[PDB]
Amino acid sequence: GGNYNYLYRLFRKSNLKPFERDISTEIYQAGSTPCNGVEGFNCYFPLQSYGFQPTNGVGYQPYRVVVLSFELLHAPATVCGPKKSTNLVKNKCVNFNF
Amino acid sequence: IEEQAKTFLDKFNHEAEDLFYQSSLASWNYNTNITEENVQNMNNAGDKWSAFLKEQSTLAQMYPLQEIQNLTVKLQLQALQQNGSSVLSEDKSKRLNTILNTMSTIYSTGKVCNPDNPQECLLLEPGLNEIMANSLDYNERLWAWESWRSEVGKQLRPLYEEYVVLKNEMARANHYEDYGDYWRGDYEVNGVDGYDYSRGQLIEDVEHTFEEIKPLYEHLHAYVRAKLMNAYPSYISPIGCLPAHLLGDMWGRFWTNLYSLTVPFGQKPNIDVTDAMVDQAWDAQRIFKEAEKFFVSVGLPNMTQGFWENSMLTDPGNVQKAVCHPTAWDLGKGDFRILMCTKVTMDDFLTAHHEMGHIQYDMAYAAQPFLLRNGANEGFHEAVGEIMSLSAATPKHLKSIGLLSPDFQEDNETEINFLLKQALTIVGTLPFTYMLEKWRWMVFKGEIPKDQWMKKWWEMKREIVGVVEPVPHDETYCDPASLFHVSNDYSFIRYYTRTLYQFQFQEALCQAAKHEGPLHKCDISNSTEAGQKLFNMLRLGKSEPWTLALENVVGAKNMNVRPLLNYFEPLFTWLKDQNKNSFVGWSTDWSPYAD
Ligand SMILES: *[C@@H]1O[C@H](CO)[C@@H](O[C@@H]2O[C@H](CO)[C@@H](O)[C@H](O)[C@H]2NC(C)=O)[C@H](O)[C@H]1NC(C)=O
Ligand SMILES: *[C@@H]1O[C@H](CO)[C@@H](O[C@@H]2O[C@H](CO)[C@@H](O)[C@H](O)[C@H]2NC(C)=O)[C@H](O)[C@H]1NC(C)=O
Ligand SMILES: *[C@@H]1O[C@H](CO)[C@@H](O[C@@H]2O[C@H](CO)[C@@H](O)[C@H](O)[C@H]2NC(C)=O)[C@H](O)[C@H]1NC(C)=O
Ligand SMILES: *[C@@H]1O[C@H](CO)[C@@H](O[C@@H]2O[C@H](CO)[C@@H](O)[C@H](O)[C@H]2NC(C)=O)[C@H](O)[C@H]1NC(C)=O
Numbered sequence: 001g002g003n004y005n006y007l008y009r010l011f012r013k014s015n016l017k018p019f020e021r022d023i024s025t026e027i028y029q030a031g032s033t034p035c036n037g038v039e040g041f042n043c044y045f046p047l048q049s050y051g052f053q054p055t056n057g058v059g060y061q062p063y064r065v066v067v068l069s070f071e072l073l074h075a076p077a078t079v080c081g082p083k084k085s086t087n088l089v090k091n092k093c094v095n096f097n098f
Numbered sequence: 099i100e101e102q103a104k105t106f107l108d109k110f111n112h113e114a115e116d117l118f119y120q121s122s123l124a125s126w127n128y129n130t131n132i133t134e135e136n137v138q139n140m141n142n143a144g145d146k147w148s149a150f151l152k153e154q155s156t157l158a159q160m161y162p163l164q165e166i167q168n169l170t171v172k173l174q175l176q177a178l179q180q181n182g183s184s185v186l187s188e189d190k191s192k193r194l195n196t197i198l199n200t201m202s203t204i205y206s207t208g209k210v211c212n213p214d215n216p217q218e219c220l221l222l223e224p225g226l227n228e229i230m231a232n233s234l235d236y237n238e239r240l241w242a243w244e245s246w247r248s249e250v251g252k253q254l255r256p257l258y259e260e261y262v263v264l265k266n267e268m269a270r271a272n273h274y275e276d277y278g279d280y281w282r283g284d285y286e287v288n289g290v291d292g293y294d295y296s297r298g299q300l301i302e303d304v305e306h307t308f309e310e311i312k313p314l315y316e317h318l319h320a321y322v323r324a325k326l327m328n329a330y331p332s333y334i335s336p337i338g339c340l341p342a343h344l345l346g347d348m349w350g351r352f353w354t355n356l357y358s359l360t361v362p363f364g365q366k367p368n369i370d371v372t373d374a375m376v377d378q379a380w381d382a383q384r385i386f387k388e389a390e391k392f393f394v395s396v397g398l399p400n401m402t403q404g405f406w407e408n409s410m411l412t413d414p415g416n417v418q419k420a421v422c423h424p425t426a427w428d429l430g431k432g433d434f435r436i437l438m439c440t441k442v443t444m445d446d447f448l449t450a451h452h453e454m455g456h457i458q459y460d461m462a463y464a465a466q467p468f469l470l471r472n473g474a475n476e477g478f479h480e481a482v483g484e485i486m487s488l489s490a491a492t493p494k495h496l497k498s499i500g501l502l503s504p505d506f507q508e509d510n511e512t513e514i515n516f517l518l519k520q521a522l523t524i525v526g527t528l529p530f531t532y533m534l535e536k537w538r539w540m541v542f543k544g545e546i547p548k549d550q551w552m553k554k555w556w557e558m559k560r561e562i563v564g565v566v567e568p569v570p571h572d573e574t575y576c577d578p579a580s581l582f583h584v585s586n587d588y589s590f591i592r593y594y595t596r597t598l599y600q601f602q603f604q605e606a607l608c609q610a611a612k613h614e615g616p617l618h619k620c621d622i623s624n625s626t627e628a629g630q631k632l633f634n635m636l637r638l639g640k641s642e643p644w645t646l647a648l649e650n651v652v653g654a655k656n657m658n659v660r661p662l663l664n665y666f667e668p669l670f671t672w673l674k675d676q677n678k679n680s681f682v683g684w685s686t687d688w689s690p691y692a693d
C-alpha cells in the first residue's frame with residue numbers, strides 16, 4: 001500500500017552548504033508572485049514522499065545509508081582502532097614492545 | 099517564463115509516477131485473478147488517475163507554448179496541454195460517448211441466425227470466424243459473408259454518420275482541418291534542424307512506397323488466383339478480381355488461411371519444432387531462459403530479477419479466472435511483468451521472444467521523464483518486437499540452441515514454402531491497410547459525400563486490392579464499420595508503417611552482424627556491434643524526433659520499401675516463373691453476378 005512516511009525535500013532557494021541541515025516547511029515560491037502561505041500555481045509545498053512498495057524494481061527500493069566522518073580538530077587525542085596483543089615469552093633474548 | 103514550466107513538470111513527474119503505479123497495479127490484480135471485488139477495485143483506482151490528469155491538463159494552459167526554447171520541456175508540455183475532447187459542448191460530449199458505446203456493443207453482441215433453423219444463432223468470434231477460416235463450401239462462405247454485413251453492418255450506418263460529424267467538430271476546435279489530420283499528428287515533427295515532417299507529408303510517403311510493392315503484389319495475386327481455381331472451379335475468372343468471401347477470413351485482411359490451398363510443395367513438411375521440446379522435458383521456465391540468453395547474447399541487460407517472482411508465466415495451479423492473453427506490462431517504478439499462459443509449442447516459443455522484446459524496449463527508455471516513455475511513434479513498438487521473432491525462427495538459430503539434428507539439410511524447396519507463408523501475412527495485408535486508411539481520410543475531409551460512401555468503397559477494392567464483391571451493396575450498408583478498428587475508434591496506419599520499419603531494422607542489423615547470404619536466413623546472435631546499433635535507438639523514447647531515431651539504426655530519415663523487397667526476392671524470382679502462362683493483373687469490370 002505504500003510507506004508514505006519517508007519524505008525528501010525537492011525545492012530550495014539555494015544548494016546546501018556541506019553538512020548543513022534544513023527542516024523548515026515554508027511554502028516554496030517558484031514564480032514571482034508572492035505566496036502568502038497558501039498553495040497554488042508556482043506556490044508549492046516543498047516536501048515529497050517516497051511511496052515505497054515491496055513490488056518495486058531494484059533502484060526503487062529503500063536503501064539505508066550511514067556516513068562516517070572522521071574529523072581532527074586540535075585536541076590531545078581521542079578514539080581509534082583497537083590494539084592487538086602478541087603472545088608473551090621470556091628467558092629468551094627477545095624484541096619487545098610494552 | 100520558461101523556468102516556471104520546469105518547476106511545474108517536476109511536481110508533475112513525482113505525483114504522476116505514483117498515481118500511475120497503483121492505477122496499473124490494480125489493473126494487474128483484476129487481470130490475473132477475476133472477481134468483481136477486483137473490478138470495483140480497479141474502477142475507482144482507475145478514475146483517480148484520469149481525474150488527476152485533467153486537473154493538471156487545465157493547469158498547463160497557464161504556460162504559453164511558443165515562449166519555450168528547450169526542445170525536451172516543449173515536448174512534455176505539448177503532450178499534456180492537449181485538449182482532445184472537452185472542446186465540445188457538454189451535451190455533444192455525452193452524445194459522442196453514447197455512439198461509441200452503442201457501436202462497440204453491436205460489434206460484440208450481434209448475432210446471425212440460420213434461415214434453415216432460426217433458433218440457432220452465431221456470434222462473430224465463436225462460430226462465424228470459424229466458418230470463414232475453415233470452410234471450403236462456396237455457399238456457406240457466401241452466407242456468412244453477406245449476413246454479417248446485412249444484419250450488423252446496417253445497424254452501424256446511421257451511427258457512423260453521426261460519428262463523423264462529431265469527430266470533425268472536435269478536431270476543428272483543436273486547430274486541425276479534419277479528424278484524419280488529427281490522426282496524422284503522431285508523425286509530425288516541428289523544428290529540429292533538418293529532421294522535420296509534415297502531417298500532409300505522410301500521405302505522399304505512403305503512396306510513393308506503395309507503387310513499388312505493386313509489382314510484387316500483382317505476382318502474388320496472380321499465383322493465388324490460379325490456385326483458387328482448382329479449389330473453386332466455375333466460380334473464379336482467370337483475368338478478373340478475387341471474390342471477397344474466399345480469402346480466408348471475414349474481411350480479407352490476412353491471406354494466411356489460404357496456405358493449405360496455395361502451398362508450393364505439399365510433400366515437404368514446413369519445419370516445426372514442437373516434438374523436440376516435449377522430448378527433452380522443457381518446462382514453462384526453459385522457454386524464457388533461452389529467450390533471456392538470446393538477448394544477453396547480443397549485448398542487452400538481463401531480466402530485472404523481480405521479473406521471475408511477480409510474473410505469471412502460466413495460467414495458475416488454481417482453476418483461476420484470469421484473462422489469458424500474451425502481453426507486456428510496464429507498471430512503473432522499474433517493475434516489469436509479463437502476463438501470458440504459455441504452452442510447450444514453437445508458437446509460444448516465438449511469442450516469448452516477441453513479448454520479451456517489448457520488455458527490453460521498456461527497460462531502455464526508463465531514464466527519460468514520465469511523459470516521454472513511449473515509442474518514438476506508434477509504429478516502433480511492435481516493430482522492435484517482431485525482429486526478435488524473425489531472428490529466432492530461423493533454422494540456423496534452432497540448430498545452435500539445441501532443437502535440430504546437427505545433420506539437418508535445408509533444401510531450396512522448403513525456403514519457398516517458408517517465404518510464401520510469410521508473404522500471405524506480410525504482403526497480403528499491405529493493400530488492405532493502404533486502401534482502408536485512404537478511404538477513411540477522404541471521408542473525414544469530405545472528398546466522399548455520404549451518398550457515395552459504399553460506391554467509392556467498392557471501386558477502391560477492385561482497383562487497389564483486386565477484390566470484387568459477390569452481391570451489390572447500396573447506401574444502406576456500411577461495410578467498413580463491420581471491422582473492429584473502424585467501429586471501435588482506432589487508427590489503422592500504424593500497421594502499414596510497422597511492416598516497413600520491421601525490415602529496415604532487420605536489414606540494418608544484419609550488415610552489422612556481417613551476414614553473407616539472403617536476408618531471410620539472418621540471425622543476430624553472438625554479436626555485440628549489432629546490439630550497440632540497436633541500443634542507441636531503444637533508449638531515446640520520445641525525447642527525439644522519430645526521423646532522428648531512424649538514422650541511429652538505418653542511416654536514413656524516412657521509411658523505405660527496398661529492405662522489404664530484398665527479403666522477398668527469392669520468392670519474387672520463383673513467382674515470375676510460375677506466371678509465364680498466366681495473366682498478371684486484373685479487370686475491374688468482371689463480377690461474379692454479372693452474367
Ligand atoms: C483474488 O484476490 C483477492 C485479493 O487479492 C483475494 O481475496 C481476499 O484476499 C484477502 C487478502 O487481503 C484474503 O485474506 C481473503 O481470504 C481473500 N478472499 C477469499 C474469499 O479468499 C481472492 O482470494 C483472490 N482470488 C482467489 C480465487 O483466490
Ligand atoms: C535543457 O536542455 C539542456 C541541454 O540542451 C539539458 O541539459 C543537460 O542536463 C542534464 C541533466 O539535467 C545534464 O546531465 C547535461 O550535462 C546537460 N547538458 C548540457 C549540454 O549541459 C537540460 O536537461 C534540459 N532541460 C531539462 C528540464 O531537461
Ligand atoms: C483548449 O480549449 C480551450 C477552450 O476550452 C481553448 O481556449 C482556451 O480557453 C481557456 C479558458 O478556458 C484560456 O485560458 C486559454 O487561453 C484558451 N486557449 C489558449 C491557450 O489560447 C484552448 O485554445 C484550447 N487549447 C489548445 C490545446 O488549443
Ligand atoms: C532447387 O535446386 C535444384 C538444383 O539446382 C534445382 O534443380 C534444377 O532446376 C533447373 C530448372 O528446372 C534445371 O535446369 C536443372 O537441371 C535442375 N538441376 C538438377 C541437378 O537437376 C531446382 O529447380 C531448385 N528448386 C527451386 C524451387 O528453386
Ligand SMILES: *[C@@H]1O[C@H](CO)[C@@H](O[C@@H]2O[C@H](CO)[C@@H](O)[C@H](O)[C@H]2NC(C)=O)[C@H](O)[C@H]1NC(C)=O
Pocket residue numbers: 395498623624
Ligand atoms: C553462439 O552462442 C552460443 C551460446 O554461447 C555458443 O554455443 C556454445 O557452443 C560451444 C561450441 O559450439 C559449446 O561447447 C557450448 O556448450 C555452447 N554454449 C551453450 C550455452 O550452449 C555458440 O558457439 C556461439 N557461436 C559462435 C559462432 O561463437
Ligand SMILES: *[C@@H]1O[C@H](CO)[C@@H](O)[C@H](O)[C@H]1NC(C)=O
Pocket residue numbers: 394399400
Ligand atoms: C545475467 O545473468 C547470468 C546468470 O543468470 C549471469 O551469469 C550474467 O553475468 C548476467 N549478465 C551480466 C551482464 O551480468
